[PDB]
Amino acid sequence: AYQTIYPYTNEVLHTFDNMTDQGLADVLERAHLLYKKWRKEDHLEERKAQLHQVANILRRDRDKYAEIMTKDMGKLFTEAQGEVDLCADIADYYADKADEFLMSTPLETDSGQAYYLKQSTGVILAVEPWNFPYYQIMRVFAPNFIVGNPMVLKHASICPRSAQSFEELVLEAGAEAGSITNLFISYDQVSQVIADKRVVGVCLTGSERGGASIAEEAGKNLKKTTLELGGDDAFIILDDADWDQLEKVLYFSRLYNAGQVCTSSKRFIVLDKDYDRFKELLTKVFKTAKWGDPMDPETTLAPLSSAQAKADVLDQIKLALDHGAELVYGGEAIDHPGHFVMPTIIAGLTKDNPIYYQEIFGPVGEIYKVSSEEEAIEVANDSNYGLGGTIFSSNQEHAKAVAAKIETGMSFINSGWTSLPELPFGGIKHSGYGRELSELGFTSFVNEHLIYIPN
Amino acid sequence: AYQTIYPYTNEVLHTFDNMTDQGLADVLERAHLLYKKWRKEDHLEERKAQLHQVANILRRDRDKYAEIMTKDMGKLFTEAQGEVDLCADIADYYADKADEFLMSTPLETDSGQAYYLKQSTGVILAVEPWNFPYYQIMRVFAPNFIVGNPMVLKHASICPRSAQSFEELVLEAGAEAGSITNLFISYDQVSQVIADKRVVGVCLTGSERGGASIAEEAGKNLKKTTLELGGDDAFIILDDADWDQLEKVLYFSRLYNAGQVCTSSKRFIVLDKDYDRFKELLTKVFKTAKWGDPMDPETTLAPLSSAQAKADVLDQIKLALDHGAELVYGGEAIDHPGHFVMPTIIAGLTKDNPIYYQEIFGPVGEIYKVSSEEEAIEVANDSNYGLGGTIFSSNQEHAKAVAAKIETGMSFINSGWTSLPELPFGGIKHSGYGRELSELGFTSFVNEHLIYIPN
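Output (structure tokens, whole complex):
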């Protein structure tokens, strides 16, 4: 069921064939041997060069990879170009930090001398989503490639060209076959891969449904995992928030990638005094959305990645309204072949409303009204999610104080989400566990090998 | 059923009542509320003091807690005193490193100000084994207590007195009720606990069967886990090994805690040149064993923890022989009420013999003969386990170079296994994943909360 179906026109561009049991078997043995090869010999310097090379090609053919993502899951070409740029950076980052992150860590003891090596463990299985085709892969491929963990990837069924093309990208960079292999497999084959003794760990970014499913199979086979699940991020606006600056980030905060971002600012928490003012501003901002062809430079709102996604976001809005939510803006159906959903804003949300605790992976602004910081922090923590979130206050000492009181994995001050090579990314609760990127992400599947020498 | 049956006499000394469903419900709610209290307001100093107090009491009543373990799982009283000493240590270590370890981490980035907080996450379920009643508990309790994660313990059924007394110990130290609670629950209840939204993680130490079951349930519920399973450590004696030292550590290496140590030196790998020389030495060492009353200072070999335990080891010895292994020494049945198994040595194991790959949790020396150093590394790695291991050589750099080629979590140079609060403990493969102790085990269930302020 792997097809590239352009979200703008809804026309199938390419259909890919599944991988067979034998094919999969061959892929794992190749990967396993490569792991052993990198364990016996020191090919580190080579992988570094190959990783830099990957960055160069991406830079060189940036527009080519960008369009592939647009035609695959229908996001703005300009955004796609941006994703690519972040990828070039994640790649150069680990290729540069390679030696530092891999050197031995000495330990302090009176009993003698001790330290630990950062070694590779084996073949890693990566399960990724469609919202950020290349970023989702590079986020975990770059670190493990440096470490020496061959990788096998099972991407989303709607972005097969990006998954396939990423493998070629790495090969074209001079990487040995098996460094990373894309797998057009079913979920039954995924459980087989996990159950294979040649696979040592699994890193999955996606939905709770799949996360629970994979994590369970992973745990049944004693395999280590890291889950990067969804978010229902709280964008808190304190009394001293800068509104001229606030106006500059709002569009991006909730309409970037049509709202299909795990760290999207799904929940807007605003004070009683600012409630009306905010409704006007969010509305003013949502009105500037120019939807249309995602390849066109002047389009600012892309269509959702699939007909199902659109159906889901709409059902969610409906449900909200059926339970008391107030329709502040949008909600008008769009007439066009594309999987479009116009920006919509809802408020008047209460705890007895199921949407209050649900994540809407679309262009839907949600306004929550509180009477104080205490209440803001309370609403913010009243969630099964804990990925990101934002604190808006001109006083940074103040924003920091509040942020630390939020049960979440990340807090962005006076801005929407941001991802960088050096910054760790992950969350808590139903948003998963484990951190990606930075140095914490580098060691997820590293074997801390202790060498102890007593006196 | 949770019962204390002295392994020496096989007499029932205690019979505890299983925890009721409502009792379980109340415990988790108390733990949840306590977690919230420590998350909303700082009580680190109080916890530090109380942990130091736990150490003080242990120091004071060492012999009382030692006898408890001996009567619970039958270990030598002197070994138990040693255990308590290691607990006192772990406790003080974490109380002393508290501030340092819980310190925020700055992040280098030229795009803005960034750092991450180390925060508590919730209630942790701990499943610990019987081979080290107190040590096993302290390994995870100390770090998590300082962190601020209340804890619920599910200990082995054969050492309920230990499990229960440890909770009392913590309450005596002054720690608020809920810091750690012992649960005399069934495995169905353990499953319920794992499914509870109040529990945020699971750290288990035990068998593969239990681990798979527990990790499977944890995964189905998105709960992070760390597993400390068995081992079959390779004790490699290089060509330049010093036999004076070798002789001094041999008894401890395999007969400490009667061989019931995950890091016991289960697989001795020697060169042809030293094969017969080693068979004599190991035999000489094993002959010095004096089994008897564990409370008696004279005793140098304790009975196993249970009848089933003995039955199992005896079967493994039998199985090895029925498949070709050679009986180098012992194997004779001890006529006595206790669960005694006389020290035994076997050799001539081949890949076609099941025992070649099985871990024996008893006083059974195993000898593997190799013709080269490379073959030694091969046999060492030809294992489904990868916990610890020892490299014996008079050349430090040589020993360190060989260690690095072993696929294991810990390597001990010129010595048997050791465990200090500053040293990370953990392995790879079927030995599990994750680490305990040192700073690494500290952050296992910690929330790295990124705070990001762009320029």
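The longest helix of chain A spans residues 77-102.
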